[PDB]
């Protein structure tokens, strides 16, 4: 399952005639595109590898 | 008279060009400006679709 | 019979209704339907509603159908079953609506609700406008508006033109006719009238009030200039002050400067301005210049 | 009936309303809609509101529709249900609006709020302007403005033209008619009047004040010159001083220098200037030169 | 009535006001709008203010 979430503030005069506004005209734009399932877990680092990436000398 | 258009494989029909046939073509009165009119010697202009 | 001509009753008002329709029966003077896709789209919609499904991919070139906009007035206290007149106006590239018929058209209000249904035969003058027509009793009322008439003991007469003197005159006339505290004035435009509680009693009160006679007091001096139609209208209160006027190709009937005498009534003003020998288009500029200078003791309004 | 013609009441003012609309029913004299995309865009908007969705990719070439701007005046003390006149003006490449009809148009104020709704049939003169028209009672008032009239014991009469003498005259007339301290003067343009607390009492006071007669004292000498229309207007206070004038192709009726006598009243000034034999366009330059020199004892205003 | 014609009162003066606008209702005698971009720009501004986005 994939989730696309959007939030922001829109000026009414930036909305086009077809009730559309580009995402670059939204003030506090919060855009999120995430997923779950084993596909999403396959894109997470292992805990040991994350620990090393954060605490290894090099 | 058929007219072809865009996005329409089939030509549309616009109408029929009917010809007038007289029984004494010598008898029409020449108005002048490339026009002939029926007279008493060439009365009864018969409309017909061309070919018949 | 003057109060009914000077005021309107609060809550007794007219609304505006609009709708879309199709006009059929034209003699090849309808829409081309190649530059107006909505005509064919709505004809297909009507046919589908009636049970005929024309395939989506098909060329429809009509000549006897025109897409039209229908306008109507919702009357005060309208009741379902009553008929009203409608105006039918072509919308795109149609040539004439001389013998057309308006099909079933729902007339929506501002709130996008159906208040009437329009269907009938158009009457077109036929120099005359060909793309506009009128249908008398062309629409039947289908919805009714709630109102507060008959509730409370106060009703407001709203003057067509704001005037403290006219408001006071109407108030004094009502008080002279129907008791001491029958009417009061709220501003230059509104007169509040006390009426008995109920529906029939208020109808009786308004029937007595409406036909009352009120002597109209003199209004403000005003000169109305219409440059688009080339007209000038001066009311009876316009006066003039003495001053000199000069304009191109105008001279004393002599010198280019012509004196204009001080005028008190309208006849004197008309005589003084006709002594100038000015065309109305020239009279417009003359009047504007005199208003700027101060000779014209009137309000110059360009409409 | 002069005070109502010389002053205006504070708070009794007019506002301006504007809006956008479509005019249909034209005889092929509407917008081309190829150079005016907003006409077709707003027609599609109206159709979508009415329930018809024309596909986005489609060529619409109309001939009976024109995009127009509607202007109106919001009257003092306007009440909902009242009707006002509107002016309809074409906006782009339209040819005529002779028999058009204005569809539902919301008239916005400066604050971008709807104060009236406009819909009706246009009247066009038909040398006459074709792209502009007027609809009498074409708009119905929908919103009402709050006001402070009837609150407090002070109301200001604002003179149309600033004058200390006229302000004092109006104050003295009100004091002579309605008691000692009824009116006071604040500046050259404003006269403060004390009125009883309430609505009806103030309406009565204003009704008595408005029709009062005030003798107008003499104003400042002023010569108004309109070069765009070619007109000159001189009020009754203009005087002349003796001096010599020369201009091209003008001579004594003889030498090119012509004497102008000292003139006290307007008739003498007109006679002296007509003795010059000057065209009004020449009279403009003559008057400007005399004002520069000092013969013209008046304020020369070019409008 | 001569002092009012020879002098002016201190503080009693006139100011000048300026502004930009659009004039509509002309009979084909308006701007060409190809050599005057501001006409179309301000018309679009007015339409956007009124609720129409070209």
Short mmCIF file of N, CA, C and O in Angstrom, two decimals, chain A residues 17-51:
data_model
loop_
_atom_site.label_atom_id
_atom_site.label_comp_id
_atom_site.label_asym_id
_atom_site.label_seq_id
_atom_site.Cartn_x
_atom_site.Cartn_y
_atom_site.Cartn_z
N UNK A 17 -8.71 28.05 -14.28
CA UNK A 17 -10.10 27.92 -14.66
C UNK A 17 -10.63 26.51 -14.57
O UNK A 17 -11.85 26.32 -14.46
N UNK A 18 -9.75 25.51 -14.61
CA UNK A 18 -10.14 24.11 -14.48
C UNK A 18 -9.99 23.60 -13.05
O UNK A 18 -9.82 22.39 -12.85
N UNK A 19 -10.04 24.50 -12.06
CA UNK A 19 -9.92 24.14 -10.65
C UNK A 19 -8.63 23.38 -10.37
O UNK A 19 -8.62 22.31 -9.76
N UNK A 20 -7.52 23.95 -10.84
CA UNK A 20 -6.21 23.33 -10.66
C UNK A 20 -5.20 24.39 -10.27
O UNK A 20 -5.28 25.55 -10.70
N UNK A 21 -4.24 24.00 -9.44
CA UNK A 21 -3.13 24.87 -9.06
C UNK A 21 -1.86 24.03 -8.97
O UNK A 21 -1.87 22.94 -8.39
N UNK A 22 -0.75 24.49 -9.56
CA UNK A 22 0.51 23.76 -9.41
C UNK A 22 0.99 23.78 -7.97
O UNK A 22 0.72 24.71 -7.21
N UNK A 23 1.72 22.73 -7.60
CA UNK A 23 2.19 22.57 -6.23
C UNK A 23 3.22 23.61 -5.82
O UNK A 23 3.50 23.73 -4.62
N UNK A 24 3.79 24.35 -6.76
CA UNK A 24 4.78 25.37 -6.46
C UNK A 24 4.16 26.70 -6.05
O UNK A 24 4.89 27.64 -5.72
N UNK A 25 2.83 26.80 -6.07
CA UNK A 25 2.11 27.99 -5.63
C UNK A 25 1.46 27.81 -4.27
O UNK A 25 0.65 28.65 -3.87
N UNK A 26 1.79 26.74 -3.55
CA UNK A 26 1.22 26.45 -2.24
C UNK A 26 2.25 26.83 -1.18
O UNK A 26 3.41 26.39 -1.25
N UNK A 27 1.84 27.66 -0.22
CA UNK A 27 2.77 28.28 0.71
C UNK A 27 3.50 27.27 1.59
O UNK A 27 4.72 27.10 1.47
N UNK A 28 2.77 26.61 2.48
CA UNK A 28 3.38 25.65 3.40
C UNK A 28 3.16 24.22 2.91
O UNK A 28 2.50 23.40 3.54
N UNK A 29 3.76 23.93 1.75
CA UNK A 29 3.53 22.65 1.10
C UNK A 29 4.22 21.52 1.85
O UNK A 29 5.44 21.54 2.03
N UNK A 30 3.44 20.55 2.29
CA UNK A 30 3.93 19.31 2.90
C UNK A 30 3.53 18.18 1.96
O UNK A 30 2.34 17.93 1.76
N UNK A 31 4.53 17.53 1.37
CA UNK A 31 4.32 16.46 0.40
C UNK A 31 4.96 15.19 0.94
O UNK A 31 6.12 15.20 1.35
N UNK A 32 4.20 14.09 0.94
CA UNK A 32 4.67 12.82 1.46
C UNK A 32 4.28 11.71 0.50
O UNK A 32 3.15 11.68 0.01
N UNK A 33 5.21 10.79 0.25
CA UNK A 33 4.97 9.65 -0.64
C UNK A 33 5.67 8.45 -0.01
O UNK A 33 6.89 8.31 -0.15
N UNK A 34 4.91 7.60 0.67
CA UNK A 34 5.46 6.49 1.43
C UNK A 34 4.70 5.22 1.07
O UNK A 34 3.73 5.24 0.31
N UNK A 35 5.16 4.09 1.62
CA UNK A 35 4.51 2.82 1.39
C UNK A 35 4.81 1.84 2.51
O UNK A 35 5.63 2.10 3.39
N UNK A 36 4.11 0.71 2.47
CA UNK A 36 4.33 -0.38 3.42
C UNK A 36 4.40 -1.69 2.65
O UNK A 36 4.44 -1.71 1.42
N UNK A 37 4.41 -2.80 3.39
CA UNK A 37 4.64 -4.11 2.80
C UNK A 37 6.12 -4.43 2.76
O UNK A 37 6.98 -3.59 3.03
N UNK A 38 6.43 -5.67 2.38
CA UNK A 38 7.82 -6.11 2.38
C UNK A 38 8.66 -5.34 1.37
O UNK A 38 9.89 -5.28 1.52
N UNK A 39 8.04 -4.72 0.37
CA UNK A 39 8.77 -3.86 -0.55
C UNK A 39 9.35 -2.67 0.20
O UNK A 39 10.50 -2.28 -0.02
N UNK A 40 8.57 -2.07 1.11
CA UNK A 40 9.06 -0.94 1.88
C UNK A 40 10.08 -1.38 2.93
O UNK A 40 11.04 -0.65 3.20
N UNK A 41 9.90 -2.56 3.53
CA UNK A 41 10.88 -3.04 4.51
C UNK A 41 12.20 -3.43 3.85
O UNK A 41 13.24 -3.40 4.51
N UNK A 42 12.17 -3.80 2.57
CA UNK A 42 13.40 -4.10 1.86
C UNK A 42 14.23 -2.85 1.56
O UNK A 42 15.39 -2.98 1.14
N UNK A 43 13.68 -1.66 1.78
CA UNK A 43 14.39 -0.41 1.57
C UNK A 43 14.78 0.26 2.88
O UNK A 43 15.11 1.45 2.89
N UNK A 44 14.74 -0.48 3.98
CA UNK A 44 15.22 -0.01 5.27
C UNK A 44 16.54 -0.68 5.61
O UNK A 44 16.70 -1.89 5.43
N UNK A 45 17.49 0.12 6.11
CA UNK A 45 18.75 -0.43 6.55
C UNK A 45 18.54 -1.36 7.74
O UNK A 45 17.65 -1.16 8.57
N UNK A 46 19.38 -2.39 7.83
CA UNK A 46 19.41 -3.20 9.03
C UNK A 46 19.85 -2.38 10.23
O UNK A 46 20.57 -1.39 10.10
N UNK A 47 19.40 -2.80 11.41
CA UNK A 47 19.69 -2.04 12.62
C UNK A 47 21.19 -1.98 12.89
O UNK A 47 21.72 -0.94 13.28
N UNK A 48 21.90 -3.10 12.68
CA UNK A 48 23.34 -3.10 12.87
C UNK A 48 24.04 -2.19 11.87
O UNK A 48 24.98 -1.47 12.22
N UNK A 49 23.59 -2.20 10.61
CA UNK A 49 24.21 -1.34 9.61
C UNK A 49 23.94 0.13 9.90
O UNK A 49 24.82 0.98 9.68
N UNK A 50 22.74 0.47 10.37
CA UNK A 50 22.45 1.84 10.77
C UNK A 50 23.32 2.26 11.96
O UNK A 50 23.86 3.37 11.99
N UNK A 51 23.45 1.37 12.94
CA UNK A 51 24.31 1.64 14.09
C UNK A 51 25.75 1.90 13.66
O UNK A 51 26.40 2.83 14.16
#
